[PDB]
Amino acid sequence: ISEITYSDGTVIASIDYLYFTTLAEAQERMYDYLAQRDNVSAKELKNEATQKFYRDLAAKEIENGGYKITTTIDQKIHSAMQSAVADYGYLLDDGTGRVEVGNVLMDNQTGAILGFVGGRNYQENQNNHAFDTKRSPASTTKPLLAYGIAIDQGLMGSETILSNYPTNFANGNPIMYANSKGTGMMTLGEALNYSWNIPAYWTYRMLRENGVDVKGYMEKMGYEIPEYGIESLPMGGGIEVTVAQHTNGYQTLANNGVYHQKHVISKIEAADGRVVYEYQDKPVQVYSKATATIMQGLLREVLSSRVTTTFKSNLTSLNPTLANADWIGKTGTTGQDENMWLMLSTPRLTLGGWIGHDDNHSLSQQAGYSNNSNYMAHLVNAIQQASPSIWGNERFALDPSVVKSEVLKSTGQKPGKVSVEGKEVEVTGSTVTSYWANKSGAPATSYRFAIGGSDADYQNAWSSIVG
């Protein structure tokens, strides 16, 4: 008889979400093993009838064989996550109908998936929202595709200034954020805390202009994005991801820039000990350690500021000692409020969370800010109660390679003379330390100091800076 086991070898089942998810993945690994065993070439494998035969064969091989499939699942943790969604999932319901949910808890150092939530209740809806369903990651794209890459390329530092002035998509329509057409210049911190859209748009346009291999970064984390030539890319337009895959991007940032491929199956053995399949770690330095650790600091204040999520308040009340762990994270919201995300990490773990409706109709305006935050606070509490040391008490910290520059708070660049139609002008004023991931740190203030901005924009900004 074949068995699926938890990571400690305790049997899950002989051959709900846990069962079908782990069995499905194991059948895929058995497929690969059986095709290679029978000497089926890649070309023969392209044949649809051969594929169907080998997929059925892999299913039956497990049913009838005596294979031992070792999963990465932690029994206590995954059980506590099921209880949490059963008891607390109703907190998601926001008057837009029954709200669905997916979560994945991942070991930052290995990519192992310790536990997950596939949905509100398998018996009523079997769609697996942790592993199968793909939805836009919305503004949780921004740290990975826009800001993180710009920092890694030395095009941006932690206190760099960006334009949030009103600007239009190429087609003439305003770039919106809730009901605002934008404001003025702002720091990266403020752009991220609030999740403004315009600054991310200009950052991705700056990457394009510098011919940065953005696809290179993303594919190193296993993202598949069919088209990079999309204005709204850094806000999640043109991207659709599973919670498991997206959790892996945030694993990369939390793990000081080093990607480990997500997995739920670690090994499959025949009864006699032959290894059919074994996971093989292939670590990749996707962002420099400087860049990742700079981003950690920014995503810490995303949660602390409480601007787009109540999570820290919710978790402080439920478990104040766990709230004092070093949480960092980012929210995501789609344009019609169709998908909400909250991605959380401590140095040890990352927990991804999505909520939404299976038919894509809109959630309430505050579903991500309050409901999903409160739910994920209960879920994080449940995980900790079931495994008290799992989140860990380590702090994220700036890598020694980070370059620290003194820059004007107004310009996010080093003080000095600047040309402002006429008066070549001594740029003075209060300063701040800005973190960079290049060799030389911040440049001298230049007239076009911000990421993005129109001529009129700069005239207004500099006007303001003068007095």
Residue 237 in tokens: 């337009």
Pairing of strands 68-71, 3-5: parallel
Work out what residue 158 binds among Na ion, a copy of itself, ligand ZA3, none; the CB cut-off runs from 5 to 8 Å by kind. Answer: none
Contact between 291 and Na ion by CB under 5 A: the answer reads: no
Task: Identify the burial level of 336 via C-beta atoms within 10 angstroms of its C-beta, where 0-12 means exposed, 13-18 middle and 19 or more buried.
Answer: exposed
Tell me whether residue 222 is annotated as binding: yes
User: Are 395 and 254 spatial neighbours (Cβ–Cβ below 8 Å)?
Assistant: no
Residue 414 in tokens: 């080093």
Least Å distance, CB 381 to a copy of itself, is: 9
Site mask, a copy of itself, residues 336-375, x = CB under 8 A? ----------------------------------x--xx-
Stretch that binds a copy of itself, among 15-23, 129-137, 159-167, 314-322 (CB under 8 A): 314-322
Residue 320 in tokens: 């104040």
What DSSP string runs through 208-222? HHTT--HHHHHHHTT
Looking only at residues 254 through 283 of this chain, which bind ligand ZA3 when binding is defined by CB under 6 A? Answer: none
- How many CB atoms neighbour CB 87 within 10 A? 11
Site mask, Na ion, residues 83-122, x = CB under 5 A? ----------------------------------------
- Residue closer to ligand ZA3 (CB basis): 236 or 453: 236
Site mask, ligand ZA3, residues 215-254, x = CB under 6 A? -----------------x--xxx-----------------
Least Å distance, CB 308 to Cl ion, is: 11
| Number of alpha carbons in the 13 Å side-chain half-sphere of residue 71 | 28
Contact between 333 and Na ion by CB under 5 A: the answer reads: yes
What is the SS3 assignment for 145?
A: helix
Tell me whether residue 452 is annotated as binding: no
Enter the DSSP assignment of 147.
Answer: I
Work out what residue 263 binds among a copy of itself, Na ion, Cl ion, none; the CB cut-off runs from 5 to 8 Å by kind. Answer: Cl ion
3-class DSSP string for 372-414: HHHHHHHHHHHHHHHCCCCCCCCCCCCCCCCEEEEEECCCCCE
Least Å distance, CB 158 to ligand ZA3, is: 20
Work out what residue 197 binds among ligand ZA3, a copy of itself, Cl ion, none; the CB cut-off runs from 5 to 8 Å by kind. Answer: ligand ZA3
User: Are 130 and 104 spatial neighbours (Cβ–Cβ below 8 Å)?
Assistant: yes
- How many CB atoms neighbour CB 223 within 10 A? 19
Q: Which residues bind a copy of itself (CB under 8 A)?
A: 91, 306, 310, 313-318, 320, 370, 373-374, 377-378
Residue positions forming the annotated binding site: 222, 224
- Residue ranges that bind Na ion, judged by CB under 5 A: 139, 195, 308, 331, 333
